[PDB]
DNA sequence: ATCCGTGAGCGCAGC
DNA sequence: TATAATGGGAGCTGTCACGGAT
């Protein structure tokens, strides 16, 4: 009733189902622009979080009609069988034929792994293929030009691609914003707002459209919201209300400002309706004495703190350790 | 959403499932991320683990509840090496973040493992989270040289991680793993020979298929600690108006006769005093600790009234003894020894 | 209109 | 410490009237 959200969708934010966001950080979701106190649903978080990275499948045994590095769009195809449903920049995915021409066709295998990139100039000796075993792995017979084909797919992530011969101030991972200087000493800067992902084999600063947005869940996101809310204000606003035509609205006005009342008279702040610290009953009124047949006997209280310890831990461990978010 | 199974089954089942080929390269990244980590360490002096969270950290983001101006100052450093300094720097970054991805796809299996670990004293849930738990450890140690598929190395962790939580979280009164493998040892032979006896094994008859230093004693004893205490709120007759506490009295409190007759005692013991000196009584107060609860010894009661132990030990005779004789026309004092 | 949550006698005994 | 192992398991059924929110 304070925070002017629903029984569902408090629901959805403190079991985790819906994300609410405090902070748009310039946030758009289907052209429309987001805004704050806004429920967005784990893939809507994603895409404005982090990306839109697609991967479609090529059935082994065909080329790829598309080139590590090229564009498609929607309504393009990667293979025959195979089509974009969406644009960007697509990239091969495990590539079974790396033909060299020197100026030969050399078999990917699955452990096997290629650290050259596409269309590079090598020379004898050097290293353009490698595996668990350097027995089987492949080296550079003579000078030649790098070719890859047959990629087992195609990733068409929707993302911009920044090239650079200098050392790069960016490590994968971090966001940017167009402008944002990107490697280069100022040459190679951002051109749209995105996460960023160095690839030192194609030496290419790839930034992925994505914002920091700060769209949290659960009760932390509800404590600071309550604390956000000024009392004063609200009553205004809901005073203002109070003088609407429409019955339900004075009436919503009025309950909401009875609650709005309650805490300003009381002096209670509505954060505290959010807990973190839990307290524990003395343990005489909640015990777990030995009965007359020598066995003891324990308080359900009991049970329940310690389910809440083991679970509290387990989290403290699991958040300080850092692992997925899921 | 109202069943939080099925919340876990869709969150996870929107990851796919990773091909070997996907499989061998994020695990491949993931290992050698860490090496690169190491590399770094060095290189900075860092502490190892400082650094591999700095790079977490912005793996994961100040999102994550050491104040971030600290992660970005060691980025600061981290970034201000030389290029091919800030290349590991770079694959470690790439490293975690496949990690992440590994551990969030390999979840599946962790579900199709706890679902026969349940009825254990733990929910699906609870098991859940500790196997996961484990499996980002076994992430973290998984070897591709191996060339073993993940799922077999990582099953160990998940088994290992979910059975040591049974046994550390489903006794109100914690009892050692060994222990519980012990006692359920003891279930696992005493059926044997339930089963086979066609009737019902005893103290004696499992000791000695357990074998050596297994005796009866020893059954029943480990008995007694295996047992669990039960509820109070238990339910009492078939109309749920009465409870197990209900039916539970109180022991340790001043029942109101203990609490009167103590205050007697006290009472007419002082009584017996006055049959005596406060010389007399202070001594016999000191040196039974009626003075201040504490009994001091005839060295210090010889101290207080600056006198020989000898002395203060022969009028204390002499006390207990005047006593004895206004008890022998009294003897009220005995009533309360009962 | 529908759905959700709320109450629905007191003892005694209850082995 | 390594064959590989990747969407669960059990449902409670013969009240009802009222105040409330949706």
């Given at each position: 009733?304070?925070?002017?959200?629903?029984?569902?969708?408090?629901?959805?934010?403190?079991?985790?189902?819906?994300?609410?966001?405090?902070?748009?950080?310039?946030?758009?979701?289907?052209?429309?622009?987001?805004?704050?106190?806004?429920?967005?649903?784990?893939?809507?978080?994603?895409?404005?979080?982090?990306?839109?990275?697609?991967?479609?499948?090529?059935?082994?045994?065909?080329?790829?009609?598309?080139?590590?590095?090229?564009?498609?769009?929607?309504?393009?195809?990667?293979?025959?069988?195979?089509?974009?449903?969406?644009?960007?920049?697509?990239?091969?995915?495990?590539?079974?034929?790396?033909?060299?021409?020197?100026?030969?066709?050399?078999?990917?295998?699955?452990?096997?792994?290629?650290?050259?990139?596409?269309?590079?100039?090598?020379?004898?000796?050097?290293?353009?293929?490698?595996?668990?075993?350097?027995?089987?792995?492949?080296?550079?017979?003579?000078?030649?030009?790098?070719?890859?084909?047959?990629?087992?797919?195609?990733?068409?992530?929707?993302?911009?691609?920044?090239?650079?011969?200098?050392?790069?101030?960016?490590?994968?991972?971090?966001?940017?914003?167009?402008?944002?200087?990107?490697?280069?000493?100022?040459?190679?800067?951002?051109?749209?707002?995105?996460?960023?992902?160095?690839?030192?084999?194609?030496?290419?600063?790839?930034?992925?459209?994505?914002?920091?947005?700060?769209?949290?869940?659960?009760?932390?996101?509800?404590?600071?919201?309550?604390?956000?809310?000024?009392?004063?204000?609200?009553?205004?606003?809901?005073?203002?209300?109070?003088?609407?035509?429409?019955?339900?609205?004075?009436?919503?006005?009025?309950?909401?400002?009875?609650?709005?009342?309650?805490?300003?008279?009381?002096?209670?702040?509505?954060?505290?309706?959010?807990?973190?610290?839990?307290?524990?009953?003395?343990?005489?009124?909640?015990?777990?004495?030995?009965?007359?047949?020598?066995?003891?006997?324990?308080?359900?209280?009991?049970?329940?703190?310690?389910?809440?310890?083991?679970?509290?831990?387990?989290?403290?461990?699991?958040?300080?350790?850092?692992?997925?978010?899921? | 959403?109202?069943?939080?199974?099925?919340?876990?089954?869709?969150?996870?089942?929107?990851?796919?499932?990773?091909?070997?080929?996907?499989?061998?390269?994020?695990?491949?990244?993931?290992?050698?991320?860490?090496?690169?980590?190491?590399?770094?360490?060095?290189?900075?002096?860092?502490?190892?683990?400082?650094?591999?969270?700095?790079?977490?950290?912005?793996?994961?983001?100040?999102?994550?509840?050491?104040?971030?101006?600290?992660?970005?100052?060691?980025?600061?450093?981290?970034?201000?090496?030389?290029?091919?300094?800030?290349?590991?720097?770079?694959?470690?970054?790439?490293?975690?973040?496949?990690?992440?991805?590994?551990?969030?796809?390999?979840?599946?299996?962790?579900?199709?493992?706890?679902?026969?670990?349940?009825?254990?004293?733990?929910?699906?849930?609870?098991?859940?989270?500790?196997?996961?738990?484990?499996?980002?450890?076994?992430?973290?140690?998984?070897?591709?040289?191996?060339?073993?598929?993940?799922?077999?190395?990582?099953?160990?962790?998940?088994?290992?991680?979910?059975?040591?939580?049974?046994?550390?979280?489903?006794?109100?009164?914690?009892?050692?793993?060994?222990?519980?493998?012990?006692?359920?040892?003891?279930?696992?032979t005493a059926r044997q020979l339930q089963q086979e006896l066609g009737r019902e094994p005893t103290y004696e008859e499992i000791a000695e298929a357990m074998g050596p230093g297994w005796d009866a004693?020893?059954?029943?004893?480990?008995?007694?600690?295996?047992?669990?205490?039960?509820?109070?709120?238990?339910?009492?007759?078939?109309?749920?108006?009465?409870?197990?506490?209900?039916?539970?009295?109180?022991?340790?409190?001043?029942?109101?006769?203990?609490?009167?007759?103590?205050?007697?005692?006290?009472?007419?013991?002082?009584?017996?005093?006055?049959?005596?000196?406060?010389?007399?009584?202070?001594?016999?107060?000191?040196?039974?600790?009626?003075?201040?609860?504490?009994?001091?010894?005839?060295?210090?009661?010889?101290?207080?009234?600056?006198?020989?132990?000898?002395?203060?030990?022969?009028?204390?005779?002499?006390?207990?003894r005047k006593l004895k004789y206004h008890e022998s026309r009294t003897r009220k004092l005995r009533d309360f020894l009962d």
């Amino acid at each position: 009733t304070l925070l002017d959200l629903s029984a569902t969708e408090l629901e959805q934010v403190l079991y985790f189902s819906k994300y609410i966001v405090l902070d748009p950080k310039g946030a758009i979701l289907n052209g429309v622009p987001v805004e704050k106190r806004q429920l967005l649903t784990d893939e809507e978080y994603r895409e404005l979080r982090y990306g839109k990275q697609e991967t479609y499948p090529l059935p082994p045994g065909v080329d790829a009609l598309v080139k590590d590095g090229e564009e498609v769009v929607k309504g393009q195809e990667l293979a025959p069988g195979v089509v974009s449903r969406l644009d960007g920049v697509a990239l091969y995915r495990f590539p079974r034929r790396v033909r060299v021409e020197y100026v030969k066709d050399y078999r990917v295998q699955p452990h096997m792994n290629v650290v050259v990139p596409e269309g590079a100039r090598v020379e004898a000796g050097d290293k353009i293929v490698a595996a668990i075993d350097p027995e089987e792995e492949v080296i550079a017979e003579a000078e030649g030009v790098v070719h890859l084909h047959e990629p087992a797919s195609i990733l068409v992530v929707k993302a911009r691609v920044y090239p650079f011969e200098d050392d790069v101030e960016v490590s994968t991972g971090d966001r940017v914003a167009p402008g944002d200087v990107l490697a280069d000493g100022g040459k190679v800067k951002s051109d749209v707002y995105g996460r960023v992902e160095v690839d030192l084999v194609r030496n290419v600063v790839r930034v992925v459209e994505s914002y920091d947005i700060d769209a949290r869940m659960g009760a932390e996101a509800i404590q600071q919201l309550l604390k956000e809310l000024d009392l004063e204000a609200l009553e205004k606003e809901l005073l203002e209300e109070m003088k609407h035509p429409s019955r339900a609205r004075r009436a919503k006005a009025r309950k909401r400002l009875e609650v709005v009342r309650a805490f300003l008279d009381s002096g209670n702040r509505p954060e505290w309706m959010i807990l973190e610290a839990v307290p524990v009953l003395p343990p005489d009124l909640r015990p777990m004495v030995q009965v007359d047949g020598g066995r003891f006997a324990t308080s359900d209280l009991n049970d329940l703190y310690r389910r809440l310890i083991n679970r509290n831990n387990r989290l403290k461990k699991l958040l300080a350790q850092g692992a997925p978010e899921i | 959403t109202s069943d939080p199974v099925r919340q876990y089954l869709h969150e996870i089942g929107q990851v796919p499932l990773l091909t070997l080929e996907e499989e061998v390269e994020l695990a491949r990244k993931v290992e050698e991320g860490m090496e690169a980590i190491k590399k770094l360490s060095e290189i900075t002096g860092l502490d190892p683990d400082l650094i591999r969270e700095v790079v977490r950290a912005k793996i994961l983001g100040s999102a994550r509840v050491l104040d971030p101006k600290t992660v970005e100052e060691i980025d600061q450093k981290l970034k201000s090496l030389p290029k091919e300094h800030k290349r590991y720097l770079h694959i470690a970054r790439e490293g975690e973040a496949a990690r992440q991805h590994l551990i969030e796809a390999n979840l599946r299996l962790v579900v199709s493992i706890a679902k026969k670990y349940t009825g254990r004293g733990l929910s699906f849930l609870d098991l859940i989270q500790e196997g996961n738990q484990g499996l980002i450890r076994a992430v973290e140690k998984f070897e591709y040289k191996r060339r073993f598929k993940f799922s077999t190395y990582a099953t160990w962790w998940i088994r290992q991680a979910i059975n040591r939580a049974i046994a550390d979280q489903a006794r109100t009164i914690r009892i050692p793993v060994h222990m519980v493998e012990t006692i359920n040892k003891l279930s696992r032979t005493a059926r044997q020979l339930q089963q086979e006896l066609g009737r019902e094994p005893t103290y004696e008859e499992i000791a000695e298929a357990m074998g050596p230093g297994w005796d009866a004693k020893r059954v029943e004893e480990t008995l007694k600690i295996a047992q669990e205490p039960v509820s109070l709120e238990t339910p009492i007759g078939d109309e749920k108006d009465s409870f197990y506490g209900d039916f539970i009295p109180d022991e340790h409190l001043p029942s109101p006769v203990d609490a009167a007759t103590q205050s007697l005692l006290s009472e007419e013991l002082e009584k017996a005093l006055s049959k005596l000196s406060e010389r007399e009584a202070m001594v016999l107060k000191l040196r039974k600790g009626l003075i201040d609860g504490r009994e001091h010894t005839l060295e210090e009661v010889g101290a207080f009234f600056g006198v020989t132990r000898e002395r203060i030990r022969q009028i204390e005779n002499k006390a207990l003894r005047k006593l004895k004789y206004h008890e022998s026309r009294t003897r009220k004092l005995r009533d309360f020894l009962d």
